[PDB]
Design a protein around this nucleic acid. Structure first.
Lengths: 142, 62, 187, 258
RNA sequence: GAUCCUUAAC
RNA sequence: CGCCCGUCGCUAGUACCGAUUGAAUGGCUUAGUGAGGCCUCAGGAUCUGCUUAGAGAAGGGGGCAACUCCAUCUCAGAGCGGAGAAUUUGGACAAACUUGGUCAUUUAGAGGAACUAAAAGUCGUAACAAGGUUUCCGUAGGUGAACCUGCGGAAGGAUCAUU
RNA sequence: ACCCACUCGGCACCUUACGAGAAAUCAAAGUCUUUGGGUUCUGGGGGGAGUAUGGUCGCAAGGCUGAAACUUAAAGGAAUU
RNA sequence: GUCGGAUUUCCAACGGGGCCUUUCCUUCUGGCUAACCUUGAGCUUGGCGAACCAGGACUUUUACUUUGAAAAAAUUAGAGUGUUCAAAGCAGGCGUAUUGCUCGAAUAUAUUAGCAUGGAAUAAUAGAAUAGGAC
RNA sequence: UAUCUGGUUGAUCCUGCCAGUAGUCAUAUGCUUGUCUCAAAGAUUAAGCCAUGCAUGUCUAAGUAUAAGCAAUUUAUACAGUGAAACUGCGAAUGGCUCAUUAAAUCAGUUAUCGUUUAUUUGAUAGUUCCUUUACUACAUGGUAUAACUGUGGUAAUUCUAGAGCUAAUACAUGCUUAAAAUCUCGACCCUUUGGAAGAGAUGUAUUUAUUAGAUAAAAAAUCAAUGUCUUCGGACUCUUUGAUGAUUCAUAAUAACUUUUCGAAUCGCAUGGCCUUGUGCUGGCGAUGGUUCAUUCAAAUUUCUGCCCUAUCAACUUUCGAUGGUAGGAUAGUGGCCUACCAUGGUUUCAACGGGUAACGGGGAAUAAGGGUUCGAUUCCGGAGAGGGAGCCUGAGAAACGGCUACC
RNA sequence: UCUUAAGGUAGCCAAAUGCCUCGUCAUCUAAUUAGUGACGCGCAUGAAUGGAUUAACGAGAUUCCCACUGUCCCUAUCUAC
């Protein structure tokens, strides 16, 4: 947060090196892509100094498939959070429902400032970690 | 390997096995129509009940 | 004979999965190259669908590229000086991606001297016109001059020697170079 | 399962072939071909059950070897060659010109075409791309590719091939007010006349089609096949012209012509 | 207030 | 002169407890051993593609007798060599055997203590009527056995009742 | 402090049956085959048995949880003479 | 009413489709010009562009319900069939019967759930309160 | 096809169970037992073990023939018909069987690969293999072993076999074999600045590094260190673009290097019309093969969403010391704790986590006929799995393969 | 009913208490007058002449096991005095 290069390695967007030989306006260059489906990149992500090689906007991942949404339930682990998908399972024998839920763990870019009790929407993408398969694309809280 | 050959039963036996009225009705029908066994009457009853079930599931709609 | 399936690992909650399948071919992995320096030797391993893989092992001479010029030359490498994941790798001098190494880079030294000719330390009309065209750009900065004068250039290997058998790399220029030099001197 | 399945049995073959369960416990497996395993017709069942031209598989393989049956102008000496949608089969003896076209009941039924229509052919361009050496090219529904196409042509259009060369004789653009043929699903064997469509980015675009009887239904993009403009189709149609007759009429038709 | 018990069911 | 209770008698069956630092099988698991395949630092049996001088010097030249290149009937001598079966350092997959136990079962066991079921057993009547001390509940003690008694409670009581 | 009426909230009492119920009886045990206001707990023939075992609480007596093997055609509820 | 058969210059309810009495039914760029100010003599040169389509976006949430592909083939009800009825199984029929012709092998559940789609009645979440509230 | 009757009593009304009743792609046994179709048939216990016999091999006109096998040239003079054998090629990973393990596992439906192969099949795709580059190339084209047969050999013995003699290479190392347009570095001078040219090499993809391009939305002037195209030089500049979906570091071309080189008939059967300065010259079609591949089917791996029986006499579980996540790396065809190092302490759970049981492979299905439901589904179809128990692996595109090996039990 | 009053209750046992006796059964061992667990008409157990049990403790007595060893097979050698 305070320091971007706390890591042992040099975090940099792959295949992006900025030539210092010239002196042009906004000498730092950053790369981003439109994940599409109406979600827009935060204006703070427009100038942010984070890397997040798995980010949907600045990283190399791509969003395709299922678009989910839920309320963040825990936010103590880095660049990723887990949400509650509270749904009702229908029981045809008794003609009534029951409250089930699934914790799907998803990836959060440092662009969004997420919290418990916040509502987020996530998108299916390439397997990012052992359990993570989604990235948040929009935060509905304020 | 081979595709199974579909078979079905042709007579459904009455649930109450021994009652004088039904027993005498089926016996008289068989004897006066010249039948040898109750398989004929049971099979035709099964078919008639199938037809009546079809008619009910048909007329239940507008 | 190592495996790469998740069916052998604990569930996300902590449930120990049973043994449902014996190890299969598609989920195989194999031992690392641990390529070293000296007396290049390349082994070809046949993989799924042919697809020969070249395992670097004791590879000596690779190819390295300048960033700003897009100019690459084949050169020998002296040996690794840093690796971001481990220090034992630095000690035993193995080649892996994103490892910074020292290279003699006298090909680059003679290349610069033949291209611009500005000496360190302290004639044909074609060449004079060429230098006039490409002049006023040889006063970049002092760190590159000091590195060139010493004669040991900091270059990060970026290929995978364990797949293509090539410790191909790019030199460190600017932010990454400053980061790694600060890291090595930070003590 | 350690390798591809090479056999294929009855009760697993696609429905539009209509194999009797008896008289064989296996179903001719189409080989690797120009069209998918399911939505394609192998020549063996065509020549044994659909035509009775050869009453037995050994006989069909014999006539297929001895160069009397050719597909797309090429003989294709493959005992189970998968012949795809809108493919042409030319039998030089007796001059039998067959078109592998879906009927209205959702099957592949015999269709008679003349010399001109057995000569030419149509195709749905599946993907426009540029390959080696920067050459633009397109890949059609039969998997056949053509190089150097007019840049006007885009995805989901029709291209007409002369069968003398892989060059495209004419192009049909996919745009509002175009007659279309739908191949797949419950809409299989219908003429649609696309009118309007919606994007719904993410996948599986659906198009509303209203035929010449003003019946309007909806089907996905990969299922339709634009065949021509309004009125005259660019290929002859088998009897019915893809209309999906209401189920209440064929009983009268059979009781008349029975 | 000792008036304890009744070859075995049908 | 009804029904009915328990103890003790006889026979069978069922499960339970039980010394045996019980037994077997199956996991899973700490510290150990570990075949074999596999990658690897080494290793070199065994196969020749190229050039060289020290050869008896043929057979052909300028005298025709000594004075001289040529492929060669050869071998310790120089490299670039390239394939390489044995064996072998390091490392991973890791089959099979111990020492402890999460634990899952199956099973042996001298004996012990129950329950159930068997035509006319013995001893006494505990309850069924105010069952002859109303009955029951909980608790505690006592007792051949039903059971008796203390304390509190209930009526399912033998009182719906005393201006 | 009494007397008369009204009202709220109580502990309760008489009669039919609107109804309910197997009946005894019940203003709830009614508005449940014309079956659905919300919700918790418990039962599924009589035993074996509130036993065995494993837990768990107690100083103990014991409490809470709680089987099965096996056995049996009745055991039971309310009224009639 | 027309050579065992049925169209309507209206009285019934309206699945329904529109606009109005505060109902504000949501972009700027664009189109052969839209309900067309064009009217030369009753193929004729100039209204507000998304009724169909491209880029900037305001899709804030559901549950529910109506649609439309999808739970493969036999197996289910079943269209039809002198396999003699048949159970079955897809046949088969019509002739110029020496050459030929032809209808066939459909539709519902598509065992849960995702996908777009009209509604928004029924139960919540959401707004602007020591206004950083909307134009 | 929305059905009940007998049994507690002296009799009654009840609860209540017992019994009766009818059916089983549920078995078994008994009495019995002629045919028209008709077919289940070692499933429970024993996924136990097997005497014996079989179940994968294969070729055309066209990969390689000389057996001293059969047959004949009135048409080839070097066979050119079969051809036993053997070497190469493709299989044998298909099929079939069984249901042991297996309870978010598998599987059904639904999704995605913008995260991953291409001989098998289909269409198309190398005038850049002059590579010390104009006498080093023979382009009508260069080399190395070897299986039958020949033998004095073998045992209770193997689908065992070695050294001798030559045979075929599509068994395997080699490189020339049919032009550039255009561009960059080399490389005589006008003695000079508007600038170079004789001739030389380099430009296909197959792996990698680094740099590029791959965004036209309505809008006006002036030095720039140097006019970028060509000139009326007050610069007109037009044709500046190469393209789709939700977009990409996409495809794709380009720049300096990459290869230890991966590549593009050094093959087989079928005709022989014509040009001639009459030469073992000049030409020319039909069928298989690998090639850089591009893309289509046959697929396989991973994969998002949801859904699974009985148990609390399993309530807390998960970090052998990877459990959650992050960074970097390795390995894989690929993403990913798939595995290693470093960092923080996270992940699941009363909405039942974790554990135990399963006489549990799952689904499409079968049996009830009011509706609702209950139970099973090893098994004729699909998806898994295994070949006695795990473990390892070669070959092959595809096996952790068992009618393939490597060991232990 | 008799003898002197009562007749050994809870318990416990071949026990440091049992003659017979090396009791009988089981277990431990190849083999056990040993040990342990049971049985009990117990010569002659037994309730503050205290009965039964008991964690911890013990230079107390006894049995088995693992480790270890010259205790032994079967001895040998060395040092100081």
């Amino acid at each position: 947060e305070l320091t971007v290069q706390s890591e042992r390695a040099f975090q940099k967007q792959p295949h992006i090196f900025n030539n210092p030989k010239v002196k042009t306006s906004k000498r730092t260059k950053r790369w981003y892509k439109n994940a599409g489906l109406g979600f827009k990149t935060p204006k703070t992500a427009i100038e942010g100094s984070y890397i997040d090689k798995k980010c949907p906007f600045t990283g190399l991942v791509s969003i395709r498939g299922k678009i989910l949404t839920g309320t963040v339930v825990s936010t103590k682990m880095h660049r990723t959070i887990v949400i509650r998908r509270a749904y009702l399972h229908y029981i045809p024998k008794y003609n009534r429902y029951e409250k089930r839920h699934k914790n799907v763990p998803v990836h959060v870019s440092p662009a969004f400032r997420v919290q418990v009790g916040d509502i987020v929407t996530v998108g299916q993408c390439r397997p990012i970690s052992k359990t993570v398969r989604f990235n948040v694309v929009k935060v509905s809280a304020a | 390997p081979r595709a199974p050959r579909t078979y079905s039963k042709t007579y459904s036996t009455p649930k109450r096995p021994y009652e004088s009225s039904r027993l005498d009705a089926e016996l008289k029908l068989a004897g006066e129509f010249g039948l040898k066994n109750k398989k004929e009457i049971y099979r035709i009853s099964f078919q008639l009940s199938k037809i009546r079930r079809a008619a009910r599931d048909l007329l239940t709609r507008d | 004979g190592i495996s790469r399936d998740s069916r052998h690992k604990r569930s996300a909650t902590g449930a120990k999965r049973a043994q449902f399948r014996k190890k299969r071919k598609f989920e195989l992995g194999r031992q690392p190259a641990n390529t070293k320096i000296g007396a290049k030797r390349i082994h070809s391993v046949r993989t799924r669908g042919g697809n020969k893989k070249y395992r670097a092992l004791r590879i000596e001479t690779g190819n390295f590229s300048w960033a700003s010029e897009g100019i690459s030359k084949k050169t020998r490498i002296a040996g690794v000086v840093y690796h971001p994941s481990n220090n034992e790798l630095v000690r035993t001098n193995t080649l892996t991606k994103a490892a910074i190494v020292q290279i003699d880079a006298t090909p680059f030294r003679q290349w610069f001297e033949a291209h611009y000719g500005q000496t360190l330390g302290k004639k044909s009309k074609n060449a004079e016109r060429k230098w006039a065209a490409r002049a006023a750009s040889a006063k970049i900065e002092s760190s590159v001059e000091s590195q060139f004068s010493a004669g040991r250039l900091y270059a990060c290997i970026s290929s995978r020697p364990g797949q293509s058998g090539r410790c191909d790399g790019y030199i460190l220029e600017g932010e990454e170079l400053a980061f790694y030099l600060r890291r090595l001197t930070a003590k | 399962a350690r390798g591809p399945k090479k056999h294929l049995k009855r009760l697993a073959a696609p429905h539009h072939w209509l194999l009797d369960k008896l008289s064989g416990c296996y179903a001719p497996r189409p080989s690797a071909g120009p069209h998918k395993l399911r939505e394609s017709l192998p020549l063996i069942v065509f020549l044994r059950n659909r035509l009775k031209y050869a009453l037995n598989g050994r006989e069909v393989k014999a006539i297929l070897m001895q160069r009397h049956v050719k597909v797309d102008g090429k003989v294709r000496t493959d005992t189970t060659y998968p012949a795809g949608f809108m493919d042409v089969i030319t039998l030089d003896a007796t001059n039998e010109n067959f078109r592998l076209v879906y009927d209205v009941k959702g099957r592949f039924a015999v269709h008679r075409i003349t010399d001109e229509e057995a000569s030419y052919k149509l195709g749905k361009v599946k993907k426009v791309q540029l390959g080696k050496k920067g050459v633009p090219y397109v890949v059609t529904h039969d998997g056949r590719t053509i190089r150097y196409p007019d840049p006007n042509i885009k995805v989901n259009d029709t291209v007409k091939i002369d069968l003398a060369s892989g060059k495209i004789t004419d192009f049909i653009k996919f745009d509002a007010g175009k007659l279309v043929y739908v191949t797949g699903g419950r809409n299989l064997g219908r003429i649609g006349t696309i009118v309007h469509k919606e994007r719904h980015d993410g996948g599986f675009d659906l198009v509303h089609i209203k035929d010449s009887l003003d019946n309007t239904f909806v089907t996905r993009l990969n299922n339709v096949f634009v065949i021509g403009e309004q009125g005259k189709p660019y290929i002859s149609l088998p009897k019915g012209k893809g209309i999906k007759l209401s189920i209440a009429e064929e009983r009268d038709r059979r009781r008349a012509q029975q």
